[PDB]
Design goal:
Distance between the termini of chain C: 63 Å
Radius of gyration of chain A: 24 Å
Largest interface: A-E, 41 and 54 residues
Helix content of chain A: over 70%
Chains: A mainly alpha, B alpha/beta, C mainly alpha, D mainly alpha, E mainly alpha, F alpha/beta
Shape of chain A: rod-shaped
Bound molecules: adenosine-5'-diphosphate, magnesium ion
Strand content of chain C: under 5%
Number of helices of chain A: 2
Oligomer: part of a larger assembly
Number of strands of chain A: 0
Radius of gyration of chain C: 18 Å
């Protein structure tokens, strides 16, 4: 009885794997966004620096 | 260096000097000025040096390692003179702590080559033994007084030879 | 040129550290045993 | 001052019995010494704030890492910081401002380390 | 923007079958790398001082045009197509709550039924061979293989 | 290095050489004594083995329980004695467990235990230490056999690995089978032997177990002392070569230091 009751009480919370996946994919999207913004900034700064330094 | 010379001599000042009726002299010869300030404040806290009354029991002479060799080679003689006076005229027991007495020799060695003397042994002045003797021979317990002299002696590179 | 007693640990090479450890482990063990015996004697002499 | 003192004693004891490599007590002493040693390593041009050093050294010296393998310690170290630096900024700010591991700060640190160790 | 739900890990380690730990550990590691990257990446892109950059360039017009094109043009963002794992959650709603939950509850019910049936029986001091025959069919000396006395094998 | 580094190293190596020479002499004396004692024990143990090679006994092929005993010692500095013994012990254990057996291990001497405490750490039925301090006797073999029989691991087969002492310079690692009465009774050859119930035979098996343990102990101690003598001789020779090289280096460094100080003095004198 105890084995079965604890098994049920435990498998109740199997949702953490999906919650992980959720926040992990959110993190992936955020890092992509950050890289996009930094890449555009770096390119514009590179061209400006080229002009200024020449 | 770093074995406990200064800590041991400070411990001796804490013990013998604190409970010693007679006077006391401390000659810092070519040692860190940080340590001189620390000792000044530690004595002020303990009470051997009293800045208010005239009950001080310690006389300090300092010629630290920022001084040119001429001053390091003679601050030992200055402290020794103060101790000698307290030994004779006062006719009483004295303690005399010196830290270190190797800086007297070393400071003597930093000017010898410029005074025209050929160096001896491991680049020491030819008059090492005589110069050290003419000083260490005034730190003595004559029949008129009594100097207990504690000396810290740096040993360059742990080399006792 | 001669040799003197207590020179293996004066060099401080590899034999010096090896000897130091061989000594320290043994006396740590013996200290543990003696401390256990001391506790036992304490308890047995409380009464 | 609180933490590095115990770390200093532990490394001092470890260095005596290090030249070789039995009983539980000295085996655990060597284990703790090695854990602390791999804790003290560091990279280049990445100095750590004093509170972060305190957190790492506390985790290492309170016998928590004694379960982990030593070759993995560095991992933990890095990971641990990247966790504490985001979720528990408040605790690090507390340690910095008050400048001591108070009893409540110690209890927190304890629960954070216990949780993180298992989850890793 | 960011307010990630907290995760317990000792709990996360309680719900992965042995056949699946090989992906659970990889998910843990890949979350770790993503977290480290996010911490490494700044809260904001650093500001710009367009005035100075335009004030040290002969063709101020060209850099002004760069600035204006920067002002007009933004950047794109990814979506949730890769997040199709949405569907997975619904499937779980069947096992842990419809199939596994219901079957487990039925097994539980059977287990209690057995429990009280076993707990409620007369003291042995009055019981009879028949009583053990019903309650415990394991004591029934099968006559389908051992007819003649003692039914229980002589070699035992 | 500098002159003081070389001086300290040279002194340390000289002390090490002295110690290794003394240890060679001690080991040689103990070896002479152990060989002298080994002769009678050699004949005694060979006689005790007599039966099993006179009435050939083939171990049963339907049993899984085996025992491995490995005789060595606590002392180190004996070269490849403990190493060879433990190597062959793990070879045999692997072969048995691959053929499908339930092997245990008894280690007479720490060094075997240590060599085998990483792998085979759970098969230790029991291990004995305090070996090698004094020459082994029949008391030691009786104690080992008694603590083997008492520890109720009724084995179905046995092997003992020791370093048979060939010559002062050479030794061999042996494996001597040890049988249980379950095998002696169930042997056609044993049908001939008269007045052979299963109780006198059991006492005989216990005594033969003690006998083989004693034989292995004597052979092992003889070979161990010989190996320690050889190892100390080689260590002293290596220390002598190192001392020669370091003395040459020390002379070079001493002369160089004299010349350096003298040139400093000369330069100072001429630079006034
Ligand atoms: N009694 C002592 N107990 C513990 N540590 C000491 C003691 N004396 C000296 N030390 C150590 O030595 C250092 C101070 O050495 P010090 O005596 O000032 O140098 P030196 O003797 O070369 O002048 C301290 O940092 C301390 O760690
Ligand atoms: Mg000092």
């Amino acid at each position: 009885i105890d084995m079965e009751k604890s098994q049920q009480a435990l498998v109740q919370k199997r949702h953490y794997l999906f919650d992980v996946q959720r926040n992990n994919i959110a993190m992936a999207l955020e890092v992509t966004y950050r890289e996009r913004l930094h890449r555009v900034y770096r390119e514009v700064k590179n061209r400006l620096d080229y002009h200024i330094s020449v | 260096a770093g074995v406990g010379k200064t800590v041991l001599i400070m411990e001796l000042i804490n013990n013998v000097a604190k409970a010693h009726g007679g006077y006391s002299v401390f000659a810092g010869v070519g040692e860190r000025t940080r340590e001189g300030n620390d000792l000044y404040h530690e004595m002020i806290e303990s009470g051997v040096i009293n800045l208010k009354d005239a009950t001080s029991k310690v006389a300090l002479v300092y010629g630290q390692m920022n001084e040119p060799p001429g001053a390091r080679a003679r601050v030992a003689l200055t402290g020794l003179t103060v101790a000698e006076y307290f030994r004779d005229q006062e006719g009483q027991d004295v303690l005399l702590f010196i830290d270190n007495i190797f800086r007297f020799t070393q400071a003597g060695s930093e000017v010898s080559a410029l005074l025209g003397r050929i160096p001896s042994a491991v680049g020491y002045q030819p008059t090492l033994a005589t110069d050290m003797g003419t000083m260490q021979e005034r730190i003595t317990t004559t029949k008129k007084g009594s100097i207990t002299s504690v000396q810290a002696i740096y040993v360059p590179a742990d080399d006792l030879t | 040129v001669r040799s003197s007693a207590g020179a293996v640990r004066d060099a401080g090479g590899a034999f010096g550290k090896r000897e130091q450890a061989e000594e320290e482990r043994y006396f740590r063990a013996r200290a543990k045993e003696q401390l256990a015996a001391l506790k036992k004697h304490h308890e047995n002499e409380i009464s | 001052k609180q933490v590095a003192g115990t770390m200093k004693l532990e490394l001092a004891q470890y260095r005596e019995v290090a030249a070789f490599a039995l009983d539980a007590a000295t085996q655990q002493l060597l284990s703790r010494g090695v854990r602390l040693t791999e804790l003290l390593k560091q990279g280049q041009y990445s100095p750590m704030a004093i509170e972060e050093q305190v957190a790492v050294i506390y985790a290492g010296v309170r016998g928590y890492l004694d379960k982990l393998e030593p070759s993995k310690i560095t991992k933990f170290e890095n990971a641990f910081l990247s966790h504490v630096i985001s979720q528990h900024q408040a605790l690090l700010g507390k340690i910095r401002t008050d400048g001591k591991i108070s009893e409540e700060s110690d209890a927190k640190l304890k629960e954070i380390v216990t949780n993180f160790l298992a989850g890793f | 923007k960011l307010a990630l739900k907290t995760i317990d890990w000792v709990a996360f380690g309680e719900i992965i079958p042995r056949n699946q730990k090989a992906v659970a550990n990889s998910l843990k590691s890949w979350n770790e790398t993503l977290t480290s990257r996010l911490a490494t990446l700044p809260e904001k892109p650093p500001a710009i001082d367009w005035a100075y950059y335009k004030a040290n360039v002969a063709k101020a017009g060209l850099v002004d045009d760069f600035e204006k094109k920067f002002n007009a043009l933004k950047v794109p963002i990814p979506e949730d197509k890769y997040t199709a794992q949405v569907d997975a959650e619904e499937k779980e709603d069947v096992k842990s709550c419809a199939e596994f939950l219901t079957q487990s509850k039925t097994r539980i019910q059977e287990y209690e039924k057995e429990l009280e049936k076993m707990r409620n029986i007369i003291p042995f001091d009055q019981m009879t061979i028949e009583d053990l025959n019903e309650v415990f069919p394991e004591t029934k000396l099968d006559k389908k293989k051992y007819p003649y006395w003692p039914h229980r094998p002589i070699e035992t | 290095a500098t002159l003081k580094d070389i001086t300290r190293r040279l002194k340390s190596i000289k002390n090490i050489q002295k110690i290794t020479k003394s240890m060679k002499m001690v080991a040689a004396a103990k070896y002479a004594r152990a060989e002298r004692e080994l002769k009678p024990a050699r004949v005694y143990g060979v006689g005790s083995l007599a039966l099993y090679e006179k009435a050939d006994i083939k171990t049963p092929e339907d049993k899984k329980k085996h025992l491995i005993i490995g005789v060595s010692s606590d002392r180190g500095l004996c070269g490849a004695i403990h190493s060879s013994v433990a190597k062959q012990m793990k070879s045999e254990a692997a072969n048995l467990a691959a053929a499908g057996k339930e092997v245990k291990i008894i280690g007479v001497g720490d060094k075997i235990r240590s060599i085998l405490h990483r792998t085979h750490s759970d098969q230790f039925l029991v291990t004995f230490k305090e070996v090698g301090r004094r020459p082994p006797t029949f008391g030691d073999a009786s104690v080992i056999a008694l603590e083997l029989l008492n520890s109720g691991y009724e084995f179905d087969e046995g092997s003992i690995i020791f370093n048979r002492f060939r010559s002062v310079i050479s030794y061999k690692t042996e494996e001597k089978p040890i049988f249980s009465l379950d095998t002696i009774s169930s042997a056609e050859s044993m049908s001939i032997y008269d007045d052979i119930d299963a109780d006198v035979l059991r006492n005989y098996q216990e005594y033969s177990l003690a006998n083989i343990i004693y034989y292995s102990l004597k052979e092992s101690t003889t070979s161990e002392q010989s190996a320690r003598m050889t190892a100390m001789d080689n260590a002293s020779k290596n220390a002598s070569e190192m001392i020669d090289k370091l003395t040459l280096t020390f002379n070079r460094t001493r002369q160089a230091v004299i010349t350096k100080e003298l040139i400093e003095i000369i330069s100072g004198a001429a630079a006034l």
